[PDB]
């Protein structure tokens, strides 16, 4: 499976940008595009040899971890740290069988009983996304946390918090240039900060947005979608046009019309 590398050690806006750009290139072929927005591969009939991509994260502490992302939704399905790999609770028999194709040579394999969805992770973390700082420092720390979990150096709440950081800085950034932009800002000024409502709402609305766009009539939504500004004020999206600079990838929702 394709591997993309990134390190928090000496990270810059440019190195982070190249990284996210590479992730997007491995996530989608670039064949399916709608109203200028790339669509991730349809999971139906997708060969298992093209189902995942690996993201190896390293940090200043010289510690590395490898996350496994599902190309059909950009989810982080699990990770390997040394001789141990951990997977989030599979959701269907298909996903359960699919992850056995990852890190096939790790000595110890484990499957968590919980999922990687935010509601769950925030619950185990004891903190909501809005109270979890993001940036290069948090990422660097998240990597170490993930690394020492198997040896008992990381408590579950910290592990969950770490997943929340990685998922947003990798998967969400890949999905939205607007969140990749938020992370670029954090790196550029070396400031760690929790995601504002604009980031939070985009993250929660990815599925709805992907579907609205794909089912739109020549780009116009049948029903508007409500997002939030940085100050938390509400604003409506009635067309795909306004999302072009915001969403970089969509989950496959339907076949494109003639």
Curated annotation (Swiss-Prot):
Changing residue 70 to A/E/N: Suppresses the toxic activity. AMP binds at residues 75-76, 116-118. This is Ricin A chain. A carbohydrate binds at residues 3-5, 10, 45, 136-141, 190-192. The chain holds residues 41 to 298 of 576 of the full protein. The active site is at 75, 118, 172, 175. A deglycosylated form may be linked to monoclonal antibodies to produce immunotoxins exploited in cancer treatment. However, a point mutation should be introduced to eliminate vascular leak syndrome, a side effect resulting from endothelial damage. Acts as a glycosidase that removes a specific adenine residue from an exposed loop of the 28S rRNA (A4324 in mammals), leading to rRNA breakage. As this loop is involved in elongation factor binding, modified ribosomes are catalytically inactive and unable to support protein synthesis. Can inactivate a few thousand ribosomes per minute, faster than the cell can make new ones. Therefore a single molecule can kill an animal cell. Changing residue 69 to A/M: No effect on the toxic activity or the vascular leak syndrome. Glycans are attached at residues 5, 231. Changing residue 92 to A: No effect on the toxic activity but Suppresses the vascular leak syndrome. It comes from Ricinus communis (Castor bean). It catalyses: Endohydrolysis of the N-glycosidic bond at one specific adenosine on the 28S rRNA. Changing residue 43 to A: No effect on the toxic activity but suppresses the vascular leak syndrome.
């Amino acid at each position: 499976y394709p591997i993309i590398n990134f390190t928090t050690a000496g990270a810059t806006v440019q190195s982070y940008t190249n990284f996210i750009r590479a992730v997007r290139g491995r996530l989608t072929t670039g064949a399916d595009v709608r109203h200028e927005i790339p669509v991730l591969p349809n999971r139906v009939g997708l060969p298992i040899n093209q189902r995942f991509i690996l993201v190896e994260l390293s940090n200043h502490a010289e510690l590395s971890v490898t996350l496994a992302l599902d190309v059909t939704n950009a989810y982080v399905v699990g990770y390997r740290a040394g001789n141990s790999a951990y997977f989030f609770h599979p959701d269907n028999q298909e996903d359960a069988e699919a992850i056995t194709h990852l890190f096939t040579d790790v000595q110890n394999r484990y499957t968590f009983a919980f999922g990687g969805n935010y509601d769950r992770l925030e619950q185990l973390a004891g903190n909501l996304r809005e109270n979890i700082e993001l940036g290069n420092g948090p990422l660097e720390e998240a990597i170490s946390a993930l690394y020492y979990y198997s040896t008992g150096g990381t408590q579950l709440p910290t592990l969950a918090r770490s997943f929340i950081i990685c998922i947003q800085m990798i998967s969400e950034a890949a999905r939205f240039q607007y969140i990749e932009g938020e992370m670029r800002t954090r790196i550029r000024y070396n400031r760690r900060s929790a995601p504002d409502p604009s980031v939070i709402t985009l993250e929660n609305s990815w599925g709805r947005l992907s579907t609205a766009i794909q089912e739109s009539n020549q780009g116009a939504f049948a029903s508007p979608i409500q997002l939030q500004r940085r100050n938390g004020s509400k604003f409506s999206v009635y067309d795909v046009s306004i999302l072009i600079p915001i969403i970089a990838l969509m989950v496959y929702r339907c076949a494109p019309p003639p």
